[PDB]
Design an enzyme around this catalytic site. Structure first.
Site, PDB file in Angstrom:
ATOM      1  N   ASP A 181     -30.807  26.232  24.721  1.00 55.01           N
ATOM      2  CA  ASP A 181     -31.421  25.547  23.575  1.00 55.01           C
ATOM      3  C   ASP A 181     -31.719  26.520  22.425  1.00 55.01           C
ATOM      4  O   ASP A 181     -31.587  26.156  21.254  1.00 55.01           O
ATOM      5  CB  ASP A 181     -32.738  24.849  23.981  1.00 55.01           C
ATOM      6  CG  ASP A 181     -32.578  23.374  24.407  1.00 55.01           C
ATOM      7  OD1 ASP A 181     -31.466  22.865  24.615  1.00 55.01           O
ATOM      8  OD2 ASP A 181     -33.631  22.695  24.548  1.00 55.01           O
ATOM      9  N   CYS A 215     -19.901  20.823  17.728  1.00 51.51           N
ATOM     10  CA  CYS A 215     -21.242  21.008  18.273  1.00 51.51           C
ATOM     11  C   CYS A 215     -22.157  20.044  17.534  1.00 51.51           C
ATOM     12  O   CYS A 215     -21.757  18.901  17.323  1.00 51.51           O
ATOM     13  CB  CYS A 215     -21.632  22.482  18.185  1.00 51.51           C
ATOM     14  SG  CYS A 215     -21.311  23.298  16.564  1.00 51.51           S
ATOM     15  N   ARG A 221     -21.717  27.280  17.163  1.00 50.06           N
ATOM     16  CA  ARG A 221     -20.947  27.372  18.419  1.00 50.06           C
ATOM     17  C   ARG A 221     -19.457  27.079  18.209  1.00 50.06           C
ATOM     18  O   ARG A 221     -18.596  27.740  18.806  1.00 50.06           O
ATOM     19  CB  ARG A 221     -21.522  26.402  19.465  1.00 50.06           C
ATOM     20  CG  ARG A 221     -22.972  26.686  19.807  1.00 50.06           C
ATOM     21  CD  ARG A 221     -23.583  25.616  20.690  1.00 50.06           C
ATOM     22  NE  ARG A 221     -25.043  25.695  20.619  1.00 50.06           N
ATOM     23  CZ  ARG A 221     -25.873  24.849  21.223  1.00 50.06           C
ATOM     24  NH1 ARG A 221     -25.387  23.844  21.942  1.00 50.06           N
ATOM     25  NH2 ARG A 221     -27.191  25.002  21.090  1.00 50.06           N
ATOM     26  N   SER A 222     -19.135  26.069  17.394  1.00 53.54           N
ATOM     27  CA  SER A 222     -17.733  25.716  17.141  1.00 53.54           C
ATOM     28  C   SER A 222     -16.974  26.877  16.508  1.00 53.54           C
ATOM     29  O   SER A 222     -15.804  27.126  16.838  1.00 53.54           O
ATOM     30  CB  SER A 222     -17.668  24.492  16.221  1.00 53.54           C
ATOM     31  OG  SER A 222     -18.137  23.288  16.849  1.00 53.54           O
ATOM     32  N   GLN A 262     -23.448  30.996  12.477  1.00 55.82           N
ATOM     33  CA  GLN A 262     -24.687  30.625  11.768  1.00 55.82           C
ATOM     34  C   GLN A 262     -25.775  31.696  11.799  1.00 55.82           C
ATOM     35  O   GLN A 262     -26.743  31.603  11.015  1.00 55.82           O
ATOM     36  CB  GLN A 262     -25.283  29.355  12.388  1.00 55.82           C
ATOM     37  CG  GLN A 262     -24.601  28.069  11.985  1.00 55.82           C
ATOM     38  CD  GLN A 262     -25.229  26.840  12.676  1.00 55.82           C
ATOM     39  OE1 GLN A 262     -25.118  26.651  13.892  1.00 55.82           O
ATOM     40  NE2 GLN A 262     -25.896  26.025  11.902  1.00 55.82           N
TER      41      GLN A 262
END
Ligand SMILES: Cn1ccc(C(=O)NC[C@@H]2CCCO2)n1
Length: 284
Positions: A181, A215, A221-222, A262
């Site tokens: 998370d 994502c 994440r992508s 990010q």
């Protein structure tokens, strides 16, 4: 510089935030006018994540052709990817319309439906064989065929039927279920194992349309998934693998979608994944 020793040099000097801010400063800026039209407000999950006009995927529809999705086309590596946000309640039908029209074989999902106590994307696939889904706005039917649950990821076989023509296709759903998370994984080993399973399926290969990867926003994440894949492929193709420059590859990908990677932690994790992955490809 090479990668593994550039890596230790940034760790020892603690300069990951400065490296990452340089990338942000140099990244391309292209218009995203279609994304910002008022009629598309409920088609975007986040107001600051939009596809560029020049690389956006168009739906084959004359009313409204907009979806928050981008075509990342990597010329030297000879790979293409579609990066998209997690579908919204009012875009699940558009999502599967895109999969159909672009001839994709595989969908790669890097988030859980609920994270941090909030919804990160719609439940857009069926959870039981006998309870199929119909998307009436785009005239598609989706059925769960089989499901294989493993410790870090789940693979599903799905059938997508175009109800207008009665054509059917088999779609593979690759769901990475253990990204934490907060932060990034401690070791890249399970993420790399997952990438290799997607590769082995044929979903990334030229005989199919581009893989669809998402994502929640489709950039973090992508971005890590496609950056690691492309860097490892280039290390296999070139005479000198130490010439592959992960920061240059990332800036190339950011010509096609804003914001890929990010955080400085995601940047460091991408280096780690490529470094460890390059040892497994050969022998050690
Ligand atoms: C996938 N692949 C093919 C060749 C190489 C390779 O030799 N890479 C050199 C180093 C090892 C770790 C970082 O790059 N990797």
């Amino acid at each position: 510089m090479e990668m593994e020793k550039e890596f230790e040099q940034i760790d020892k000097s603690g300069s990951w935030a400065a490296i990452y801010q340089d990338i942000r400063h140099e990244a391309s800026d292209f218009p995203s006018r279609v994304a910002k039209l008022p009629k598309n407000k409920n088609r975007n999950r986040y107001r600051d994540v939009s596809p560029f006009d020049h690389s956006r995927i168009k739906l084959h529809q004359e009313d409204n052709d907009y979806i928050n999705a981008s075509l990342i086309k990597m010329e030297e590596a000879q790979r293409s990817y579609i990066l998209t946000q997690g579908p919204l309640p009012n875009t699940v039908g558009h999502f599967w319309e895109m999969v159909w029209e672009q001839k994709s074989r595989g969908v790669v999902m890097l988030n859980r439906v609920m994270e941090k106590g909030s919804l990160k994307c719609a439940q857009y696939w069926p959870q039981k064989e006998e309870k199929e889904m119909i998307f009436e706005d785009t005239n598609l039917k989706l059925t769960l065929i089989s499901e294989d649950i493993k410790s870090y990821y789940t693979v599903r076989q799905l059938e997508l039927e175009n109800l207008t023509t009665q054509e059917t296709r088999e779609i593979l759903h690759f769901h990475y279920t253990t990204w934490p998370d907060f932060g990034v994984p401690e070791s890249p080993a399970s993420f790399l194992n997952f990438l290799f399973k997607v590769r082995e399926s044929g979903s990334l290969s030229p005989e199919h349309g581009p893989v669809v990867v998402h994502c929640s926003a489709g950039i973090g994440r992508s971005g890590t998934f496609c950056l690691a894949d492309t860097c490892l492929l280039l290390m296999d193709k070139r005479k000198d693998p130490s010439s592959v420059d992960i920061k240059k590859v990332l800036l190339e990908m950011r010509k096609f979608r804003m914001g890929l990677i990010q955080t400085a932690d995601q940047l460091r994790f991408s280096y780690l994944a490529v470094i460890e992955g390059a040892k497994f490809i050969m022998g050690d």
